[PDB]
Amino acid sequence: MTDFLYSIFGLLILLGVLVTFHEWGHYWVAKKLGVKALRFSVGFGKPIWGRTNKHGTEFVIAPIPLGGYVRFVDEREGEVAEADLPFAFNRQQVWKRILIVLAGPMANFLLAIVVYAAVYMMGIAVGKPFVTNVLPNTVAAQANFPENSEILSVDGVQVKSLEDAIFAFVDHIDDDKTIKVVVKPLNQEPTTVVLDVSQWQEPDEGTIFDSLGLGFGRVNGEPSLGLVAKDSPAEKGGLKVGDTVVSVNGESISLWSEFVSFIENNPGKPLELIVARDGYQQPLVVTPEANERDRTIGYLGISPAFQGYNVINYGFFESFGKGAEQTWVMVERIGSFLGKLITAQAGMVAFLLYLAMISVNLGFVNLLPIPMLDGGHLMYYLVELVGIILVLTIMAIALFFDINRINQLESSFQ
Ligand SMILES: CNC(=O)[C@H](Cc1ccccc1)NC(=O)[C@H](CC(C)C)[C@H](CSc1cccs1)C(=O)NO
Numbered sequence: 381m382t383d384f385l386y387s388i389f390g391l392l393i394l395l396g397v398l399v400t401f402h403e404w405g406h407y408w409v410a411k412k413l414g415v416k417a418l419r420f421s422v423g424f425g426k427p428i429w430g431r432t433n434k435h436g437t438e439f440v441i442a443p444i445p446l447g448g449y450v451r452f453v454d455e456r457e458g459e460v461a462e463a464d465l466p467f468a469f470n471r472q473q474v475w476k477r478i479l480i481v482l483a484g485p486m487a488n489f490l491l492a493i494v495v496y497a498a499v500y501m502m503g504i505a506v507g508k509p510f511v512t513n514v515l516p517n518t519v520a521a522q523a524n525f526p527e528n529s530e531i532l533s534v535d536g537v538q539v540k541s542l543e544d545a546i547f548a549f550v551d552h553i554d555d556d557k558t559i560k561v562v563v564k565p566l567n568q569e570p571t572t573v574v575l576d577v578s579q580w581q582e583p584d585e586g587t588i589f590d591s592l593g594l595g596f597g598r599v600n601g602e603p604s605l606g607l608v609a610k611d612s613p614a615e616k617g618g619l620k621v622g623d624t625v626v627s628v629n630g631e632s633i634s635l636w637s638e639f640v641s642f643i644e645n646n647p648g649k650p651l652e653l654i655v656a657r658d659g660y661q662q663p664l665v666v667t668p669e670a671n672e673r674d675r676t677i678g679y680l681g682i683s684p685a686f687q688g689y690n691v692i693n694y695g696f697f698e699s700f701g702k703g704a705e706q707t708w709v710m711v712e713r714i715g716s717f718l719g720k721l722i723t724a725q726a727g728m729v730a731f732l733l734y735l736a737m738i739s740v741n742l743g744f745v746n747l748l749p750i751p752m753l754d755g756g757h758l759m760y761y762l763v764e765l766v767g768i769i770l771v772l773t774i775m776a777i778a779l780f781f782d783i784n785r786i787n788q789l790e791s792s793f794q
């Protein structure tokens with residue numbers, strides 16, 4: 381029953397964070413400009429939390445966080461004496477109101493940045509760039525590319541995912557004559573393969589990998605077990621962690637794929653195998669079980685030894701830049717979605733990605749010209765109507781980059 385409890389708790393956390401940070405961007409742009417706010421309400425329904433600070437702002441929280449507001453001072457909405465008169469929203473300049481109404485929608489964006497900057501720093505799980513099929517009679521076939529191996533790097537440029545591999549390939553195809561690929565076969569030390577890409581020009585229609593002959597797929601390896609679950613057919617059959625299956629039903633195997641082939645295709649029927657346990661060839665008998673999602677598939681309850689995924693660690697400002705990139709990508713995605721009108725992760729990381737995506741979506745939808753919205757006001761001021769610093773900032777950051785590389789050459793031989 382924790383399903384509903386947990387999903388509702390997560391949804392409330394997400395909505396509360398988003399609305400609170402939108403209204404907090406509003407209130408912060410108000411406070412850092414002299415425009416004193418009046419009320420800071422978050423959510424819909426019956427207020428439960430109401431606090432007044434030093435000035436007089438009334439922070440109010442509500443249980444239904446489908447939208448909030450920050451009310452300021454208007455001569456039609458209220459009236460304050462000369463004590464706080466030049467701090468009213470309508471009395472202020474029309475120039476400050478542009479930054480005031482833009483505080484919220486940008487804030488969401490900023491939030492996404494941070495959130496993305498938080499997930500690229502810690503790490504993220506991606507699929508290994510694993511070649512499983514070498515096409516006959518292609519460029520990778522002339523080089524005798526190792527069928528079944530994990531791509532480590534292309535032209536020295538290290539790759540830790542599939543998109544990295546395709547980018548490193550596309551970038552260096554028509555830039556020089558050949559391409560060196562560092563790749564690791566199974567049970568072997570890493571080795572380099574040279575691809576002659578001089579004669580081949582471009583294929584107007586076709587996968588850029590099939591043009592070279594690189595078929596990708598699942599990661600493979602030895603039939604060694606890394607995990608065995610409790611109350612699993614493997615545990616009852618005597619399979620242990622560290623066992624290497626040598627043969628199944630007389631037929632010797634050499635890959636995890638053959639073992640899963642024997643497992644999935646024979647549910648409920650016992651398989652007599654021989655495994656290499658601690659340098660000892662030992663016979664076992666295990667009976668696969670009918671899978672829960674598909675009784676056609678046989679289920680044994682084992683996980684392979686070899687590592688399947690990769691984790692990408694990023695620094696500080698590199699992660700900030702990647703987060704800005706992903707936020708802009710989300711912006712373009714929701715833009716195309718609106719134009720239509722007219723990946724296994726590791727825990728809460730997926731929830732943070734969903735939070736950032738929904739933040740981008742909210743900052744985009746509330747920045748459109750609609751009746752009562754921030755974008756409505758930004759359009760209201762748009763169709764109603766410095767550089768020294770602009771150059772000095774780029775000058776300063778260029779000097780910083782140069783000095784940082786100077787220190788990098790020394791403080792940071794064959
Ligand atoms: C999910 N709710 C929304 O997206 C609505 C507008 C809307 C409703 C339905 C469908 C599409 C859009 N936006 C807001 O609530 C803004 C705050 C959000 C960004 C946290 C809010 C708009 S003002 C008011 C809305 C309701 C009473 S007062 C704002 O800008 N405060 O500074």
Ligand SMILES: [Zn+2]
Pocket residue numbers: 402406484485754
């Ligand atoms: Zn707003």
